[PDB]
Structure formats: structure tokens, C-alpha cells
Amino acid sequence: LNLLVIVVDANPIWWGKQALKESQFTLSKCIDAVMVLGNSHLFMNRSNKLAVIASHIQESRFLYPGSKDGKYELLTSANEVIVEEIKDLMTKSDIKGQHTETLLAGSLAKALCYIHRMNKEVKDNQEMKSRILVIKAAEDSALQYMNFMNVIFAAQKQNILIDACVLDSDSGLLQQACDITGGLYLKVPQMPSLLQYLLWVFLPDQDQRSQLILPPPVHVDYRAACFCHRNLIEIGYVCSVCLSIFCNFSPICTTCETAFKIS
Amino acid sequence: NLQEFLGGLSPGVLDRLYGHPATCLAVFRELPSLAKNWVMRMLFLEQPLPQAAVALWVKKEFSKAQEESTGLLSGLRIWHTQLLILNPIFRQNLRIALLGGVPSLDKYAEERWEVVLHFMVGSPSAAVSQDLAQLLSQAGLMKSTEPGEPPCITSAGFQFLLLDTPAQLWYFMLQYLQTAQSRGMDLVEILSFLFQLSFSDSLLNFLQHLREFGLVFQRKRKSRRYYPTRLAINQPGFIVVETNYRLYAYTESELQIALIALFSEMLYRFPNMVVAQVTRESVQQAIASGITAQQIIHFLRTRAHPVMLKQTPVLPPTITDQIRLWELERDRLRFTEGVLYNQFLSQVDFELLLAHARELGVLVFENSAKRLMVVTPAGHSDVKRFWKRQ
Amino acid sequence: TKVDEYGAKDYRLQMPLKDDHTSRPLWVAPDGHIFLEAFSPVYKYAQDFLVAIAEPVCRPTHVHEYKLTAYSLYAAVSVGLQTSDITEYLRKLSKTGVPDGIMQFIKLCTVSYGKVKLVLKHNRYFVESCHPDVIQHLLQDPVIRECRLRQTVSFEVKQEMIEELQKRCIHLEYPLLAEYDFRNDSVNPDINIDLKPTAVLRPYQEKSLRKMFGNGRARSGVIVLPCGAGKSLVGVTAACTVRKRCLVLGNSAVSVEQWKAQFKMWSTIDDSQICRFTSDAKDKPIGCSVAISTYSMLGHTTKRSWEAERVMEWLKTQEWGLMILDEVHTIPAKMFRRVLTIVQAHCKLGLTATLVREDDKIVDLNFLIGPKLYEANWMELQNNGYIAKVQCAEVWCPMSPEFYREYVAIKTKKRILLYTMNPNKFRACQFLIKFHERRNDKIIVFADNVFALKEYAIRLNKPYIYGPTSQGERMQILQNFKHNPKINTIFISKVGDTSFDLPEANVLIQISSHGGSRRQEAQRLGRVLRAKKGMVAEEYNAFFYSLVSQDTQEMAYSTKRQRFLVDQGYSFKVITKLAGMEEEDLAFSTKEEQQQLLQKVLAAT
Amino acid sequence: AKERPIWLRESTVQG
Ligand SMILES: Nc1ncnc2c1ncn2[C@@H]1O[C@H](COP(=O)(O)OP(=O)(O)O)[C@@H](O)[C@H]1O
Ligand code: BEF
Ligand SMILES: [Mg+2]
Ligand SMILES: [Zn+2]
């Protein structure tokens, strides 16, 4: 089976800006595309399970752990919980001018442990192939690089894919994550047609992803910069303690305070 | 299989079957691995796409999967080339499904199914029902020839007994569905219910038959609501096989003892064990009755005691091999009707007749050295006419 | 006795089911048949008890079967068991309970032991018992009074009528306890026989002797062990315990020689004490503490030669504390049983591996020698590595069409030669020897028909042994086969089916047999059943092949003679065809060769 | 290491 996880970046500031811009694309449609995308995954097979996770400047909350419309009864329950939960999160929220950038590493951290928690629960007979369908919708935060970098390695160790589907901005850090763990990357420019990308590129599972033609991987610039400047450096200097990329030769690196001896 | 049954259907019935959304989901689920993704692709599309695009969406590796899935769904007629848009009813109906628009039960199913099997064999204590009796007889696995006397078991009926309960039930359902149209019961209604069950007058009669088989159980004096059993949606062994043709069946049910007695001699009876010996006389009788050896090995194989599971092969090879030899022993002489031609004075023309017989597909055996061949009597006239024509 | 619809003995109105039946692995039907489970945690304890009370009928690797008989129970009381102990433990082991009929049956056959005893002293046989009443009851019996010589009460009985006395004693439910008190018998001088420390008896060997010597006195009975298990060591040990003059009765000149070698290897008795009594020669049987001979020599009925007569006179006028009888199953023969009365022995120990016969005389061993003291399980020893693992097989050789033409028509007992001399069978034998010889295997080939034995021996140019071959010549072949690498295959007849010790003989082949002789088949397979040097328990160290002719009377006999081995768990894999035969330059590859062979077979008549 | 022959190692029956 597969355990899909949609880490939606429901940033009120960015999505609210779209509302102010009165653009055709809106968060409500995005959740519907996620909703339809989520419904399709379970619709593939009974054994499949999914989960939905949002993101906010304050905190991230899980959007997911008769047939009045005629659809499958199980999918009806998923729609109700997701529709109500997202509205509660969006409508209710505090204000903090200092912190306005969306957080994604924290939301992913909640995702990675969920598979492990679910991986323990699943019986030994059935093997699970979990995946995380991160849908980024805003620029990354500078201060979250280290935190985001740790979660990615955990996914690689536990073999969970991060199929980033960023939109409106190419996240240099996020595109780094999908490459390390083998996840897919896609920068959809047609936001109104976002869902059709999901059903094609992201919907198929890993066991079937190989036997399918998908957009080629985008070049990932593994830039390194000196801690002085934050400017790209090709030849970097580090010490055996800080493990810190540095500008040039120094008698002692500040972050270390070590009594480095010349030679 | 379920998908096999759907393929052998007309387009008219198929579209009718594509009614309420649950049916489309049921038919969708059996799309093996690839065609499922294709279905989601061309679900929101109202414009047909070229067939070439579909072919090039699967890498050269595992290409065979691309064709087989396409062939399967073409048989299902989900889309049409239209020159590959899905069926408008299927697309709409599927969209409705896709966000649009207990312990007692298993025992009851096992017991109710068992009594039917009891009736299958000459068990005096079995459920009696005129509709059920004619159903099995018309199912091709039983024959009465005298309504007053209880019916016997046909050659295929004995084989049906040894089949595993899942396959045993599915085959009966497959036969029932085919006979439903003949008796006047619409196939779509019963077939659609089965898909809906996995999650009218015709249904009421159909539901009663399902209740008889134990798949469904109302529990409330035949109320509108029903509680399907485990078997309706779609076990440790007890037999110890010895190298000396001895079976110790840890059976309390009389049906299992009856099954094992088909191809073995029962020696002693104990509550949790029955001693049976697989003598060639019993096996030859079982093969003569209609049984096939592979079933006998499979039937013993599936009902294997846990102690034998660790051993590999679980069934000792000699017992398995000996059973096969007993079966092959009976069929040493392969009788085959045919017409022999001799005195082939025209040696040159004999080859020409040989070629003509081969072309028609009537020739069975030939001997060039002796200039003779055997042809089935069905094609005897054709070759006789050819010889007369000269 | 109720019979179910499927011809099955319904025993559900007879016995109940015990609540804790899962732990209890035993079933007890009123018919006496006992079905024990080999996979139960308590199998080891149950098997030892069950084998003593009941002789095994079939012992597959998973579920064993035993049968209860008066003789089988009589063995249980002799070893030391009692009716209360047997029934109590039997009920404890039974997962369904002991039916009333069986419970009383066990009691019935336990109140007969110890009532009457047979004692031999000063070359005189007496009927000893501590209860005068049972003796008086015996005297009422006509034949018992007829064979009479013409507190404790004893009446002397003539030696010549011991057999009739013992047989009627069982018929009177008063078995004679022919138990020897060797430790309290100073009349017969103690021999210098001693067990060397280098000789250590295996657990089954020691356990068998434990039953024999459960008490201070030595018990007389039949001990059964698989071929190659080491019955020679057990017999030598029995003599060591008795420490009296020992007489060993082999089957042929080869048996005594192996008996002589085993004594020297497994005992400290000097070579001078060891002696042989055979037509080939004799090592001064007049002066010897241990005598080795054969049933033919002692059982010879016609007038003996002067050389043999002198030894026979000494043998009759002697007292033996232990008479080891190798190949016990031949004792019930009409004349071989007389050897028991001809020689005066206190304790008669019987060693054998195949306690089966095509007749009903096998039961006579209960009183002729005694109850079956022990019977080891072949599979148990096979897994333990005491006996080499054998992959029994039955090569199916299609009959030659020319031969079958005559075989079907001919019915004047000439079929045996016809299907024994099957060219197809010959080719399989020829191919198998070549393939196995290339694998450094020591092959043995058996053939009941000497004609077939000769036909194959010369054609393959391999040594062959049968009747006329002198003892020295046949002994030479075995020594060469045992040690000479060049002699990798030998041909043997009915002579060497028993007592032939070939530890390195990995492969065996059989091209002919004497009907459905289970004893012959099991004994024949015994030759390669000896433990191998580099043997591994689960590697199928040895192999056995029983070439058979398809669609022939041989098939029925092959099944008949395989009954005993399968009862011991051995599976006879069927080999319809042998791979690589076509690419091998085998004989009789042309119809002319086969045609010539058929005429020769017909000529033999 | 002197493995068993094909006929002994595996079943030779056609079925
Ligand atoms: N305890 C033992 N230790 C070593 N070798 C043994 C032992 N018991 C038996 N053997 C060997 O096993 C074989 C037994 O041969 P034999 O006594 O003729 O057997 P049987 O009388 O059972 O047919 C011989 O090779 C013998 O040396
Ligand atoms: F059992 Be043996 F070969 F004396
Ligand atoms: Mg011996
Ligand atoms: Zn540093």
C-alpha cells in the first residue's frame, strides 16, 4: 500500500494576497484540488491511506488523521473533516508581525513521524510505501534551512518521497529536498490547471512512477557561500569542529574559538 | 475472474451496468496498475486525445504493461477512439463516485455454505429447497433425471467440491449470473448489486438466493436492511499426509470427511482425527468419477496440517508422484476416433492428399514410411469428396 | 465394531474425548490400534512405553501406529512393567480414554507372567513355579502330561519336547519365564570374556541390554535393531555380561567370520578361545569358550561327517549360559527351530533386524526364544547418524516389446527369467553402475536369479558371488571390495542378503528378487545401511535402487516387498526414466543384441 | 561436492 501525505502550504498572507489581487487562482480551489487529489488516491485501492497537513506562520495542524451526494461513503467523511478543519484554521489565527514567513520544516516534521507512527501500526504482512506530496505556495524562510535539512535526511533514511509541487516561486531549498530523497519536482505555471498536474505527475505511486515518462529533473544548484557574506563560493574552508564554510584563511574561526595553530 | 466475466459482455449491457457510481468504482478498482492512472488523466477532459500519446506515456521498459492494460480497457469499452475519451456515462458516473453528485456473520456463511455442500454429496442431513436443487442441476454440476429421487453429482460436480471455498463460491456465482439471463432475471441488476455489496422483484428473488447460500443475512425476518457476510464481498489445515499413503484428517465436520472419502478409504473415526488410506483403488475410482489428480494434490495441499507446512515439499514427493502415476495409469490407451486410409497406390498423390489434409486441419496422425494417415470422421467426407473429385 | 458409511470402523459410541486432548498425543481404539503423534512434545516418553507394550505397525515421520497383542503385552510385564502401571500411564497418555474391552484385555494378559518358570540345570529341564495350583492345572492338560519325563514344585520334562511344552504353556495362558540367573550360577565356569574400554555401546545398544538385564538375572528374548545398527556389539556385550560359555549361531560361513572379527574388535577374548564350526574348517570346537557356527551346520538333519559329528557330540553334551541366535526370523523354519532343543542353553538371545515373514510362524519366536525385548526406530537412529541415510528409489524399466510379446503369452513359470533378463532393465543397471562408480561410490548389486546374476556379471565384467563360490573365494571378494579401490562394484545373490558388513557400500542396486519378500528387501537394503565414515545425517549418504519392469508382475512384488520399509518411514521414489542414458554407450543398443538375448532366455527354460 | 543425480534430486514424473 501507499501512505500519501499532502503538506499544503496554506499561508494566509500569500493566499490572502491572491484574494486582494482578485486573481482567478484562490486557496478554496487549491484545497479542492488537494481534496480531489486526496480522494483519487484512496479511490485507487482500498488499502491506500492518506493524510493532509496545512502550514501557517503560527502552527501547522493535520487536516486528516449515508452517501447524500451519491459518492463513496468513506470519501464523504474525508471531505467533511477537511472542509471544516481548514476553515477553522484559516478563520481563527493570531497576529504576529515579527513572524510572517510560512513554516514548512515544522509541518514536514509532523509528517515524517506520522509515517513512522503509522509504519509501526501497520501489520508485518503488508509492506507500505509512504510518500509526502508537499505543495509549496510561498517563498522559503532563511532561518529554517538547518531545520528543513534534517527532516529531508530522515525521509531519505526512512525512504519517503518528497514530490514538491511548488507554485508561484521556485524554492531553491525545496527543490533540493526532492532530489535527495528521490522525490519529484514541478513548477506549475498554470495555477488554475494545477490539479491536472497532480493526477498525472504526482498521483502515480513510486512502484509505478518508474514505468512512466515524467518531466525531467531540473538542475539543482548546490551553492555554498561563506558565512561572512552569504555569497556563492566554489572553494570553501572549514574546521573539524564548526564544520563551517568560511570566506578565506583566518588565524581562528570565530564560531569555534579554537586555538588553531599555524603550519 | 471478475474482470474476465465483464469482458464477455455486450456494449449495451456494459453501459447499462455503468449506472450508480459504486459500479464504476468497482470496475475501476480492477484496473491492474497502469490503466487506473490513465482513467484519472482523461476524466476531466471533454476532448478526445490521439492514440499515439497514450502509447508514448509508458517507458520502453515494461512496455508490455502498456498494451495489455489498453487491450483490457478496450474490451471494457471504457473509452472509444472517436477518430480516446471515456464513456460519457462512465466519466460522469465515475465523477459522482470521485467527489460528485461480525464474528457470527462468518460462522453463518461457513455453515450455510456447508449445508449446500452437504446436499451436493449424498448427505441425508442437508438443507432441502426445490429452487436450490434445480439451480445446482441447471448449474451444470448436478443432474437428477428423476425429480422424486434426490439428484446425484455429475463429473464436474465432484471437481467443484474439491475447489477452495473462494473459488468454489465464485464459480457458482459465475454460473448463476449466466443462468440469470436465461431464466429471465436481468444481469445488470444482480451484477450491479454485487459491486455495491462489495462496499425490486429481481433483487428480492436474487437476495433470497444469496441468503440461501449464506452470503447475506438479514437477521430481522427478511427486512429491507441486510448484513452481508465475509464471503459476500468477493483457514488452518487439518490433514497429515504420510509417506505410506495414510491421511490423518483432524476433522469434526462430516463434509470434510465426505470430501476426503471421495479419493481415499476411511479406516478409523475420532473426534479430532480420521484415519484414511490413499489406496490406488480409491484414487482410481476418484479419477474415474471425474476428479483430476492435481485437484487431489491441491485439495490435500491446501488442507495441510501446520506440522507439514515446515517440511518442503509439505506433501511428500512420493505421495504426490504416486497419485499422478495412478491417474496416468488409467489413460495409457489414448482412444481417438478416426478413419484410416491405406493401399495408397498413388505414392506421389499421397503427399498431396497429406498436404490437403493438413491444410484442412483434419489429419491427426500420419506415417510417411507406410504411406498412411488417420483423419477424424468429421472431416472424412471432405477428404472423401476430395478423393472423389480427383 | 460399528462401521460408518465409508467402510470405516466407527468408534464414537465406544470412547469419549479428553478435555486436555491437545497435550495428550495418544489414541486408543477398541481394536487395540494405537496412533501416536511424532510431533507431540511428549513423544519420547510415550514411544519408549508404547513400543514395549505394543509392537509398531507403521512409524511414519509424523504419526506412528501400534497394535496391541497378547504377545506384545507379555513383553511389557517381562521388562518390568505391570498392568496397573501400563493402564494408568496408557490412560494418562490417551487423549480419548482406554475402552473397557482394551482395559480388561490388558489385565487379562498380565496375570499370566511369573506363574510358571522354566529352569535348566545339570543338563535337565524342570518346570519351576512357586504356586502348586498352576502346576496342577498344567498337569491336567493332556499334552503337558504327555511330554513329562518318562513352596516350590518342579517336575522334570524331556528336552526333546521343550517346544511343545512351551507352545502349550502360552496356549494355557501360563508363559514359561526362561530367565537365567547367571550371576548366581557358579556351576558353569566364568569365561575370561570382557568388554574392552575402547568399546562403547550407543544409547539404543545400552537400552536394549537394559531390558535384558533389568534385574540381576538375564532375560531371554528377541532384540530387533535396524541393519547396520551394530547388533554384533550388542551380542558380544551380552556374552560379556553373562561371562559364561557363549554359542553364536550365524547364517552362513561369512556370518561366523564377521562374528569372529567383531568379538576380537569389541572384546578382550583371546583368539584361542574364539572358534568356528563350519564345513570350511574348525578352530578346535572341542576346546573353546566361545563357539561360532551356522544354523545349517547345527541344524543339519542327515548323518554328520566324522569331523562334524565329533563336534556335534560335544555341543549336545554341554551347558551354555547364553545362546546368541543371529537372524532370528529364520528360526521358525521347520528344521532350524530344532537347533534350540539340540543345544542346551540357559538364556537365548536373538538378534535380527527384520522381524517379519511371509508366513504366520514369526509369532513362534515369542516362546521359541522369548518376547521381543527391544525394537529401535529406524528413523530415530537415521536422524541420529547411527545409520546412513538412504534415498530409496524404484527405477521403472519399460519391458522390451519382443520380451513382453512372449511374457504375456507364456505363463508356465518362465516369466521370471523373461522379465528378470530385461534388456531395458540391464541398460539402467549398466548406466547406474557407471555413473555411481564415477562418484567414488561402492556399489552392491543383488539378484535372486543366479542366471541373471551370471548374465550381468560377465557382461559388465564384475565379480559375482553365489552358492558354489567357495567360502574363501567369496571372502576374498569382500576383502577386495572393502579395501581395493579397483573393485568398486560387486554382484551378490541370496547368499549375501544377510549379515554382510560393508560399511563403505554407499550405493545398492537390485535387479531380481524372490517374490514379495519384505524380509529379503529390508535385509538387502541393510548392507548399505551401515554408518559411513564421512556420513552426514541429512545428506542421503547411501542410496538404494530396485529396478523393476513396467507393466509386469514384478510391479506387484515390488509394492509388496516395500511394505516393511515404508512402515519404517522409508519412501520409495519412483524413477520413470533416467537422464543421461541416451548419451551413454550402453549394451543391448541394437535389436539384434536384444533378439539374441531373448532366444538365450527361452533356451534356459 | 558429489551432488545427487537429477532423477533423485527432483521428480521425473511428466505431470
Ligand atoms: N558402538 C559402535 N562403535 C563403532 N562402530 C560400531 C558400533 N556399533 C556398530 N559399529 C559398526 O557398525 C557395523 C555393524 O555391523 P554388524 O555388527 O554386522 O551389524 P548388524 O549385526 O546390526 O547387521 C560395523 O561396521 C561395526 O564396526
Ligand atoms: F542386521 Be545385520 F546385517 F546382521
Ligand atoms: Mg549382524
Ligand atoms: Zn571552528
Residues 6+ apart with CB under 8 A from B276: B246, B247, B248, B249, B260, B261, B264, B265, B266, B267
Helices (H), C463-604: 471-483, 518-526, 553-561, 563-567, 591-604
Partner-chain contact D12 C435, CB within 8 Å: no
For A206, the 3-state DSSP assignment is: helix
b/e per residue, B255-277, with b = 16+ CB within 10 A? bbbbbbbbbbbbbbbbbbbbbbe
Per CB-CB distance under 8 Å, the chain D contacts of B327 are 15
After which residues, if any, is chain B broken (C to N > 2.5 Å)? 83, 101, 199, 234
CA distance A202 to B10: 35
| Whole-number Å distance between alpha carbons of C587 and C247 | 49
Secondary structure of residue B255 in the 3-state scheme: helix
Ligand 2 pocket, CB under 6 A: C 227, 231, 353, 498-499, 526
- Which amino acid is it at B262? L
Q: What are phi and psi of A99, to 5 degrees?
A: -110, 110
A124 three-class SS: coil
- Number of C-beta neighbours around residue B104 at 10 A: 11
- Tell me the DSSP string of B211-237: HHHTSEE--SSS-S--EE-HHHH----
- Does the CB atom of residue C258 touch ligand 1 within 6 A? yes
> A152: CA distance to ligand 4 center in Å?
25
How far apart, in Å, do the first and last CA atoms of chain A sit? Answer: 58
10 Å CB burial of residue C251 (0-12, 13-18, 19+) is buried
Dist. CA C58–CA C67, nearest whole Å: 9
CA-CA distances (angstroms) from residue C141 to C135, C138, C144?
10, 5, 5
CA of B244 to the centre of ligand 4 (A): 79
- Which residues of chain C does D10 touch, with a Cβ-Cβ cutoff of 8 Å? none
Cα–Cα distance for residue pair C156/C309, rounded to 1 Å: 28
* DSSP code per residue over chain D: --PPPHHHHS-----
Tell me if C62 and B321 make a contact (CB, 8 A cut-off): no
Q: How crowded is residue B336: how many other Cβ atoms within 10 Å of its Cβ?
A: 9
Any contact of A with D, at least 3 CB pairs below 8 A?
no
Looking at ligand 1, which residue's alpha carbon is closest to its atom 14?
C230
What is the C-alpha to C-alpha distance for residues C106 and C101, in angstroms, rounded to an integer? 9
Give the distance from residue C435's alpha carbon to the nearest chain D alpha carbon, in angstroms: 9
Q: Which of B248, B265, B270 has the CB atom closest to C7's CB atom?
A: B265
- Amino acid sitting at position B259: L
Closest Cα to atom 16 of ligand 1: C230
Cα torsion A114, A116, A122, A127: sign? positive
For residue C261, what are the CA distances in angstroms to C269, C276, C498, C501?
11, 11, 16, 11
Name the structure determination technique.
cryo-EM
Strands (E), B278-330: none
| CB neighbourhood size of C557 (10 A) | 18
DSSP class of residue C16 equals -
Q: How far apart are CA C467 and CA C448, in angstroms?
A: 11
* B374-B378-B379-B382 Cα dihedral, nearest 10 degrees: 130
* CA neighbor of A40 nearest in space, from A203, A209, A161, A193: A203
**8 Å CB contact between B324 and B293:** yes
CA pair distance A214, B41, nearest whole angstrom: 14
Signed CA dihedral, C475, C480, C482, C487: sign only: negative
Which of the listed residues C205, C498, C525 should we mutate to test ligand 2's pocket, taking the one with most ligand atoms within 8 A of CB? C498
Distance CA C255, CA C294 (A): 8
In angstroms, how far is CA B1 from the centroid of its own chain? 7
Q: What is the DSSP letter of C317?
A: T
- Only one residue has cell 484414487, namely B283
The DSSP line for C396-417 is EEPPPHHHHHHHHH--SS-HHH
For residue B60 the three cell numbers come to 520502453
Q: How far is B268 from chain D (nearest CA, A)?
A: 32
Q: Which residues contact B389 (CB under 8 A, 6 or more apart)?
A: none
The answer to whether the annotation marks C227 as part of a ligand binding site is yes
* Contact between residue C541 and residue C533 where contact means Cβ atoms under 8 Å apart: no
For residue C216 the three cell numbers come to: 540381576
DSSP result, C187-230: SSPPP-----TT----HHHHHHHHHHTSSSSBP-EEEE--TTS-
Question: Which residue minimizes the CA distance to atom 25 of ligand 1?
Answer: C503
* Residue in B94, B99, B198, B199 to test binding to A, most A beta-carbons within 10 Å: B99
3-state secondary structure at position C369 = coil
Across the A:B interface, residue pairs with CB atoms under 8 Å apart total 74
Contact C95, C67 (CB under 8 A): no
Give me the half-sphere count of Cα atoms (radius 13 Å) on the Cβ side of residue C565. 29
Tell me the CA–centroid distance for residue A153 and ligand 4, in Å: 24
Q: Do chains B and D touch (3 or more CB pairs under 8 A)?
A: yes
What is the C-alpha separation between B372 and B339, in angstroms, rounded?
10
Triad C82, C84, C89: Cα angle to 5°: 95
Residue C169 in grid coordinates: 504353556
A165, A133 in Cβ contact below 8 A?
yes
| C159 C-alpha to ligand 3 centroid (Å) | 29
Report whether A181 contacts A160 (CB < 8 A).
Answer: yes
Bridge partners (DSSP) of residue A162 are A132
Instruction: From B277, B248, B270, B261, select the one nearest B161 (Cα to Cα).
Output: B261
C231 assigned to a ligand binding site: yes
Q: Is C578 on the interface with D (CB under 8 A)?
A: yes
In terms of Cβ atoms closer than 10 Å to its own Cβ (0-12, 13-18, 19+), residue C181 is middle
Q: Which helix (H) or strand (E) holds C549?
A: strand C548-549
C413 burial type by CB count under 10 A (0-12 exposed, 13-18 middle, 19+ buried): exposed
CB of residue C228 inside a 6 A radius of ligand 1: yes
| Rounded Cα–Cα distance for residues C541 and C391 (Å) | 8
H/E stretch holding B160 = helix B155-162
**HEC letters along B35-49:** HHHHHHHCCCCCCCC
Sign of CA dihedral C250, C251, C256, C259: negative
The residue behind cell 511389557 is: C76
SS3 content of chain C, % helix, strand, coil (to 5): 40, 20, 40
From residue B177, give the alpha-carbon distance in Å to each of B185, B187, B188, B214, B232.
9, 7, 10, 17, 14
Pairing mode, strands A161-162 and A129-132 = parallel
Q: What is the distance between the alpha carbons of residues C139 and C174, in angstroms, rounded to a whole number?
A: 12
Residue with cell 553334551: C317
Q: What is the CA radius of gyration of chain D?
A: 9
Amino acid symbol at C599: Q
C595 in helix, strand or coil?
A: helix
Q: Are C517 and C524 in contact (CB under 8 A)?
A: no
Centroid of chain to Cα C201:
20
Using DSSP's 3-state secondary structure scheme, residue C446 falls into strand
> What is the C-alpha to C-alpha distance for residues C342 and B240, in angstroms, rounded to an integer?
51
Is C379:C530 a contact under the CB 8 Å cutoff? no
Bridge partner residues of C396 (DSSP): C548
Residue C600 has a CB neighbour count (10 Å cut-off) of 12
- Closest approach of chain B CAs to the CA of A70, in angstroms? 6
Q: Is the torsion defined by CA of A92, A94, A99, A104 positive or negative?
A: negative
Closest residue by Cα to residue B65 from B33, B38, B97: B33
**CB contact at 8 A, B93 and B85:** no
Could you give the angle at the alpha carbon of A33 between the alpha carbons of A28 and A35, nearest 5°? 90
Give, for C106, the enclosing helix (H) or strand (E): helix C100-108
> C-alpha cell of C270?
583371546
Tell me phi and psi for residue C387, to 5 degrees.
Answer: -130, 140
Chain B CB within 8 Å of residue A40 CB: yes
The one-character DSSP state at A56 is: -
Q: How far is CA C322 from CA B281, C234, C369, in A?
A: 50, 13, 12
Please give the Cα distance from C91 to C85 (Å, whole number).
Answer: 10
C-alpha distance from C179 to closest chain B C-alpha (Å): 39
Task: Give the whole-angstrom CA distance, residue C544 versus residue C493.
Answer: 16
Helix pair angle (B254-261, B103-120), 10° resolution: 40
C555, amino acid identity: M
SS3 C67: strand
Those residues with Cβ within 8 angstroms of residue C332's Cβ, 6 or more apart along the chain or in another chain: C357, C359, C361, C362, C364, C365, C368
Q: State the Cα–Cα distance between residues A37 and C440, nearest whole angstrom.
A: 70
Pairing of strands C176-177, C116-121: parallel
Instruction: Let me know: does C570 contact C409? Beta carbons within 8 Å.
Output: no
Give phi and psi for B257, each to the nearest 5.
-60, -40
Interchain contact C540–D (C-beta under 8 A): yes
Assign B107 to helix, strand or coil.
helix
Q: Whose alpha carbon is nearest atom 3 of ligand 2?
A: C499
Report the C-alpha gap between C263 and C247 in whole angstroms. Answer: 12
Helices within chain A (DSSP H only): 12-21, 27-44, 73-91, 105-121, 145-158, 172-181, 194-197, 206-209
* Bond from prior residue into B313 cis (ω within 30 degrees of 0): yes
> Do C555 and C549 contact (CB within 8 A), yes or no?
yes
Is there a contact between C515 and C557 (Cβ–Cβ < 8 Å)? yes
What residues contact residue B201 under an 8 Å CB cut-off, 6+ apart?
none
Q: How far out from the chain centre does Cα C4 lie?
A: 38
Q: How far apart are CA A177 and CA A183, in angstroms?
A: 8
Instruction: Answer whether D9 touches C (CB < 8 Å).
Output: no
> Per the structure block, which three cell numbers stand in for C464?
559375482
DSSP secondary structure letters along A58-94:
S---BS----SSSS-HHHHHHHHHHHHHHHHHHHS--
How many angstroms separate the CA atoms of C477 and B75, rounded? 77
Write out the three cell numbers for C551. 507393466
- Pocket probe mutation, ligand 1, options C255, C501, C524, C541, max atoms within 8 Å of Cβ: C501
C226 annotated binding-site participant: yes
Q: Cα(C190)–Cα(C183) distance, rounded to whole angstroms?
A: 10
Beta bridge partners of C325: C249, C350
Terminal-residue alpha carbon distance, chain D: 30
B320 contact residues in D (CB cutoff 8 A): 11
Report phi then psi at A77, rounded to 5. Answer: -65, -40
User: How far is B114 from B102, CA to CA, in rounded Å?
Assistant: 19
Per the CB < 8 A criterion, the answer to whether C428 and C581 are in contact is yes
Could you give the CA distance from residue A179 to residue C270 in angstroms, rounded to a whole number?
88
Q: How far is the CA of A242 from the centre of ligand 4 (A)?
A: 4
Residues of C in contact with B316 (CB under 8 A): 571
| 8 A C-beta contact, residue C326 and residue C251 | yes
Beta strand B239-241 with B246-249 is: antiparallel
